[PDB]
């Protein structure tokens, strides 16, 4: 197939053997803010440097997928301060601010925004990736965000 490959990580539920390694307070089965055509989202109240961490040891090979993507809803406030981190060889190897990945715009409140990061361009990483995390960097409690359609893409 000439169409670029894709690998679902969360689509109304964990897919393709991805595991919930999160340490922040969150739910994988939120039904209060859900994209049309989905049934659940991941809700995450960013606080105390917690994170939603979806892992699968060496499951994302950059010889097959160039990017990690997800849809995020800023909830009541939008503009959350979050970092996206890629894990390789069981260690964090690079981070980007979500506002940066969003073209320099804080994520909009009460609406869904596509976030895309290139493994090579944004993280300078290649080879086999073990997971991705979305982490609070404020410490102080931020308004809840919702995450949906997490996918690795060629
Ligand atoms: Na909705």
From Swiss-Prot:
Belongs to the glycosyl hydrolase 9 (cellulase E) family. May digest the spore cell wall during germination, to release the enclosed amoeba. This is Endoglucanase. It comes from Dictyostelium discoideum.
């Amino acid at each position: 197939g000439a169409m670029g490959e894709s690998l679902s990580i969360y689509k109304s539920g964990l897919k393709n053997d991805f595991q919930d390694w999160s340490w922040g307070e969150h739910s994988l089965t939120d039904t209060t803010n859900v994209e049309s055509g989905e049934t659940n989202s991941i809700s995450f109240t960013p606080k105390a440097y917690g994170a939603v961490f979806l892992g699968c040891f060496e499951c994302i090979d950059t010889d097959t997928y160039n990017n990690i993507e997800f849809d995020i809803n800023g909830g009541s406030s939008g503009a959350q301060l979050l970092r996206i981190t890629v894990v390789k060889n069981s260690k964090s190897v690079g981070s980007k601010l979500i506002t940066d990945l969003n073209g320099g715009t804080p994520i909009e409140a009460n609406s869904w925004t596509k976030i895309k990061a290139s493994f090579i361009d944004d993280f300078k990483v290649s080879g086999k990736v073990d997971g991705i995390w979305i982490q609070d960097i404020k410490g102080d409690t931020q308004s809840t965000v919702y995450i949906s359609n997490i996918i690795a893409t060629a």
